[PDB]
Design a protein around this ligand. Structure first.
Ligand SMILES: Nc1nc2c(ncn2[C@@H]2O[C@H](COP(=O)(O)OP(=O)(O)OP(=O)(O)O)[C@@H](O)[C@H]2O)c(=O)[nH]1
Ligand SMILES: [Mg+2]
Lengths: 908, 169, 74
């Protein structure tokens, strides 16, 4: 059974793919169509699909097929058919003037692709030829022409070509731009042109300025586009054209036209003023996009040209006006957000100038920025509760993110204004605290929160008084309280240096740990406190653990929130004296162990699962941040834990999540204590070794790697870890036989382990159990993997192993015995079997081969290159020799990457 | 309710793993280049009722691209995906948007940044400016840690049905 | 080692307030907050900045160099 690639069959297949509900039917139809598109018969049937007899859904495939035949497979198209292929397209495009827009666009894309594929010399004047060819409808002909001319430059931005060809095309295209522009200018200038056309003109112009085109040439179309802004149907087109022509990178050099642009943008002000009043969001939004597009893209130059300081100021004001548009951003006005970027740039530019002139400009724009603070704090101010509750969830989130962006801009504003701003904020807040709406207080406090973290201690006079004000603030409303907590959390680093103030803020935060509505803030703040102010915290600690116990006893916090509290308590205990710390930790973990005992004895239940996970996680988090080493009783607790852990593991081995959670405790506890992790090593190796024999898990490999890197040098705890390593190697390699690509995580992690081991203790490779040949086989196979990070890790291992040769006889013999295959695999990878991103990770290996074993690499490369077209068929016989001669020399490491890049670029 | 969603974006992004994560609830560690289009129906429960999104999973690699734009026809909406750890994917975004608009102009599209869960991030969160349109919104999704899993489909469902109040069951 | 969107630079001038003017071997450089306070940069010192996508003129000081780069040949 078979279906020849004819129009009827292709059409039936299209109808099936587009309408048949069966998945496999679509998957079959689509494949048969994959064949149909590439098939030669396509050249005949495509046109027949474009006939008026068929639905647009069918016609479009006909157009797309052509587009793909030309774009993907241009090399196959014979030279004699060229003209025949061109002309045809044109004619069809003409027919689709009144036809479906989608198909017309696809055909124009196709013709553009053909043009670019024969742009350099074969089609000398494509633009002028299109113009002449188009000049039965007349208006639709112009529209089609404009669509083509619009698609032409963008299809170049995505056309994949070699550097020389790409440049050679870009030049000839730049030549054509100057022929396209007048056609656009004339069509716009003439009053006999309809809006439908003018839009296509603006879009065409905008599509052309996406390429690096001299602004001085664009000027006329800029003027016309500014004129078109008064028209309602042309606004969205003209604004995009204007912005795309102004915001372009090359426009920075042309200051002469950029100065002539300024008075035009200031002209839009009355249309902006009316739009803000009339509630026309689209218009004010567009006009603001224009204003900012000028501002942020030409600020430094506009300031440098001091002779027009008056204009720029006005511009700034306009932008300021767009910042202070009455109402809130999410709903009332879409404008304000767009403004933010500009402000930063201006600040930057003003700080970029030499100090002498910088003072001159700062004297002008400092009050502008002080006004910017008043504006931004008022807009970020929450609306009334009655109104806010009515906002769309999307709108609330929009305002949240928006508020984050403002919080970000205030951070730089502080870098500009300095302590004076802090003084103003403190004075305002004090004035407010000393009807009454929390929104204002929370606004100022939000500004203070945004700024506080970046504030230096050198000029921090406001901070003490601020901390003085914090308790005076009402905890009535939740948002204000959250802002308070976050503000404290930001003040943490300052609170560490001045522990006398801690007593005034601590109870305010500990109270918030009780309320469930503040969970995210409070805890975080507490963590941020405990992590920063640890040495001075122990006198207050008795109440902290007590309140932590009560707040945890009640189900006030979600689990993920509790975890942070466990980390916090870890940081807290890290400072306290040993005995008291052990007693307190025992007290806090005592209810947790009892619940763990209760879950283990019970048969594995779905309700019990999450309950066990919670305890395991709380333990892990408690262990992550508790470190008396300040780079241990935690080991004492770990020993007692080990039995219950073993029972729980015996009961819940099959559950992957629970197992991972159980391993996590050891992972964190090991990462925390470097040298103090030794007295638990013998017990840990037996637990992990049995766990890895049952089911392979990458986390276990990583843990073994950590144990290796930490405890290698200390021999006293080395013997048990050695057995776990060798066991792991035997289990992986045997698992790898069943499925190579089946478990990339395990492979990647294993490569990490072997690399760490090769670096830390090369002698370990001498042991007999490990199949040093099979390992090398697995790593050699790893470079072929489609998973990128696994390949990268294998490359890392390779990079580590090479200098170890000679120093270790196992590595030397292994490399001598199986060395050629590795270079074969690397050359295969460079040839085109690997992505271009990991190339630099591959090259490293090669470089190492030069640094460790020149004599072997010379012969290996020499032999590997001999067969014709080994890495790639495109490679010439002389190029193999140039790569050989280059790579041979005993050469810097960085140049090898460049050589490799050029080679792989040539191959692909 | 039936709505066709075309899932596009650069190759190796992890969109197939997202779809698989939603269909089976299992994250797949291994990466296989998707050939052509992978059509899978995903159904989400809502207070209005059940909404069905027919996901056409597009090839990202150029060589496996296949029919390409031909999948886009009749799509009510789209999801563009990029890898946070790789800048090139983000650089290619306007290209995917451009091809999508040509076939379907005003359809709601969601931009998704993935592998955010990964410690090292190549793309800062500040850079994203795609959501500046009314029919566009950005999300940080993590197919592994399941962070913001339903968010794109939720936003799309709301914008399509016409009910901003619509929530997931 | 340098990454994409990042150039290795050497300090040319000082602007203060966490800002420096420098000339990459391949612009204005900006050093941020606590990291900038912790490490003092000087003129003609080796550095490494990350290019900003919006403006090629401005970059962010990412790493302070203490010799290996000369051996690398970057
Ligand atoms: N860390 C992390 N990795 C992810 C995540 N999502 C996907 N990945 C990675 O992406 C890989 C899967 O690739 P695929 O989903 O097959 O990529 P694709 O969507 O098929 O791309 P195409 O073939 O072009 O269609 C996995 O091996 C993961 O390592 C994530 O959320 N976090
Ligand atoms: Mg896929």
């Amino acid at each position: 059974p078979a279906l020849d690639f004819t129009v009827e069959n292709v059409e039936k297949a299209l109808h099936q793919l587009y309408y048949d509900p069966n998945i496999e039917n679509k998957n079959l139809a689509q494949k048969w169509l994959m064949q149909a598109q590439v098939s030669p018969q396509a050249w005949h049937f495509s046109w027949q699909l474009l006939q008026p007899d068929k639905v647009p859904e069918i016609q479009y495939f006909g157009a797309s097929a052509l587009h793909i035949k030309i774009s993907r497979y241009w090399s196959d198209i014979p030279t004699d058919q060229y003209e025949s292929l061109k002309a045809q397209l044109f004619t069809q495009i003409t027919r689709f003037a009144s036809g479906s827009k989608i198909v017309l666009t696809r055909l124009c894309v196709a013709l553009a692709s053909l043009a670019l594929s024969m742009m350099p010399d074969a089609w000398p004047c494509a633009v002028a030829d299109m113009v002449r060819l188009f000049q039965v409808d007349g208006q639709g002909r112009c529209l089609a022409l404009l669509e083509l001319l619009t698609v032409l430059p963008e299809e170049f931005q995505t056309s994949r070509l070699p550097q020389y060809r790409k440049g050679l095309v870009r030049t000839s295209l730049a030549v054509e731009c100057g022929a396209v522009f007048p056609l656009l200018e004339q069509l716009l200038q003439q009053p006999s042109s309809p809006s439908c056309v003018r839009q296509k003109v603006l879009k065409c112009f905008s599509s052309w300025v996406q390429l690096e085109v001299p602004l001085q040439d664009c000027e006329a179309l800029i003027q016309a586009a500014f004129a078109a802004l008064q028209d309602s149907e042309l606004f969205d087109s003209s604004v995009e054209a204007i912005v795309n022509a102004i915001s372009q990178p090359d426009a920075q050099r042309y200051v002469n036209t950029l100065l002539k642009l300024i008075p035009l943008v200031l002209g839009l002000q009355e249309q902006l003023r009316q739009a803000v009043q009339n509630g026309d969001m689209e218009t004010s939004h567009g006009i603001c996009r224009i204003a900012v597009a000028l501002g942020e893209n030409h600020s430094r130059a506009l300031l440098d040209q001091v002779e027009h300081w008056q204009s720029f100021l006005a511009l700034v004001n306009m932008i300021m006006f767009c910042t202070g548009i009455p109402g809130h951003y999410p709903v009332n006005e879409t404008t304000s957000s767009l403004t933010l970027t500009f402000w930063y740039t201006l600040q930057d530019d003003i700080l970029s100038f030499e100090a002498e002139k910088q003072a001159v400009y700062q004297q002008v724009y400092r009050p502008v920025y002080f006004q910017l603070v008043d504006v931004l704090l008022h807009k970020a101010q929450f609306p009334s509760d009655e109104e806010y509750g009515f906002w769309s969830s999307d709108e609330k989130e929009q305002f949240r993110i928006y508020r984050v962006d403002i919080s970000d801009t205030l951070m730089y504003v502080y870098e500009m204004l300095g302590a004076e701003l802090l003084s103003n904020l403190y004075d305002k807040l004090g004035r407010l605290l000393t009807p009454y709406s929390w929104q204002h207080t929370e606004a100022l406090l939000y500004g203070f929160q945004s700024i506080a973290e970046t504030i230096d201690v050198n000029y921090s006079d406001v901070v003490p008084g601020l901390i003085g004000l914090i308790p005076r603030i009402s905890i009535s409303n939740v948002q204000l309280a959250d802002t308070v907590m976050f503000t404290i959390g930001a003040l943490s680093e300052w609170l560490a240096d001045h522990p006398v103030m801690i007593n005034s803020v601590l109870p305010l935060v500990l109270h918030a740990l009780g309320n469930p509505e503040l969970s995210v803030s409070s805890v975080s703040t507490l963590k941020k406190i405990c992590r920063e102010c640890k040495y001075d915290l122990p006198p207050y600690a008795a109440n902290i653990v007590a309140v932590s116990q009560d707040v945890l006893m009640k189900q006030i916090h979600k689990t993920s929130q509790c975890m942070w509290l466990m980390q916090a308590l870890g940081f807290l205990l890290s400072a306290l004296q040993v005995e008291e710390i052990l007693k307190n930790l025992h007290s806090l973990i005592s209810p947790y162990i009892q619940q763990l005992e209760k879950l283990a004895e019970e048969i594995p239940n779905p309700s019990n699962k999450l309950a066990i996970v919670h305890i395991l996680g709380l333990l892990s988090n408690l262990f992550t941040t508790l470190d008396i080493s300040h780079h241990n009783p935690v080991v004492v607790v770990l020993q007692q834990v080990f039995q219950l852990i073993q029972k729980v593991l015996s009961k819940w081995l099959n559950d992957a999540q629970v197992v991972e959670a159980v391993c996590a405790i050891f992972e964190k506890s090991v990462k925390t204590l470097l040298d103090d992790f030794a007295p638990m090593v013998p017990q840990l190796c037996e637990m992990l070794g049995r766990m890895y024999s049952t089911i392979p898990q990458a986390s276990a490999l990583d843990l073994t790697r950590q144990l290796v890197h930490i405890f290698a040098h200390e021999p006293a705890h080395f013997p048990p870890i050695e057995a776990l390593f060798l066991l792991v190697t035997s289990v992986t390699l045997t698992l790898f036989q069943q499925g190579p690509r089946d478990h990339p995580d395990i492979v990647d992690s294993f490569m990490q382990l072997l690399a760490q081991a090769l670096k830390r203790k090369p002698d370990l490779f001498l042991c007999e159990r490990l199949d040093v040949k099979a390992v090398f086989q697995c790593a050699v196979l790893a470079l072929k993997f489609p998973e990128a990070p696994t390949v990268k890790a294998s490359c890392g291992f390779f990079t580590e192993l090479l200098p170890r040769c000679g120093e270790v006889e196992s590595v030397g013999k292994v490399v001598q015995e199986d060395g050629r295959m590795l270079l074969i695999a690397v050359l295969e990878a460079i040839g085109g079997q690997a992505s271009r991103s990991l190339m630099d990770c591959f090259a490293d290996i090669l470089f190492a081969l030069n640094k460790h074993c020149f004599s072997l690499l010379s012969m290996w490369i020499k032999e590997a290159l001999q067969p014709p077209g080994f890495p790639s068929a495109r490679l010439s016989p002389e190029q193999k020799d140039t790569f050989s001669q280059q790579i041979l020399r005993e050469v810097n490491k960085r140049r090898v990457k460049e050589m490799v890049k050029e080679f792989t670029l040539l191959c692909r | 309710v039936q709505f066709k969603l075309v899932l596009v974006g650069d190759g190796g992004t992890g969109k197939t793993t997202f779809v698989k994560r939603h269909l089976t609830g299992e994250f797949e560690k291994k990466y296989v280049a998707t050939l052509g289009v992978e059509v899978h129906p995903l159904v989400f429960h809502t207070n209005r009722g059940p909404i069905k999104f027919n996901v056409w999973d597009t090839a990202g690699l150029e060589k496996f691209g296949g029919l390409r734009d031909g999948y886009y026809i009749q799509a009510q909406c789209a999801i563009i995906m990029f890898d946070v750890t790789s800048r090139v994917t983000y650089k290619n975004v306007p290209n995917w948007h451009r091809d999508l608009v040509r076939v379907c102009e005003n359809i709601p599209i969601v931009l998704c940044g993935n592998k955010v869960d990964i410690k090292d991030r190549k793309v800062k969160a500040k850079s994203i400016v795609f959501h500046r349109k009314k029919n566009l919104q950005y999300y940080d999704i993590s197919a592994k840690s399941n962070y913001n899993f339903e968010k794109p489909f939720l936003w799309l469902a709301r914008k399509l049905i016409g009910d901003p109040n619509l929530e997931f069951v | 080692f340098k990454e994409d969107g990042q150039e290795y630079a050497q300090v040319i001038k000082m602007l203060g307030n966490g800002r420096l003017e420098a000339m990459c071997f391949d612009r204005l450089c900006h050093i941020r907050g606590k990291l900038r306070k912790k490490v003092w940069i000087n003129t003609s010192d080796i550095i490494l900045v990350g290019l900003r996508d919006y403006q090629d003129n401005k970059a962010d000081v990412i790493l302070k160099y203490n010799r290996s780069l000369k051996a690398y040949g970057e």
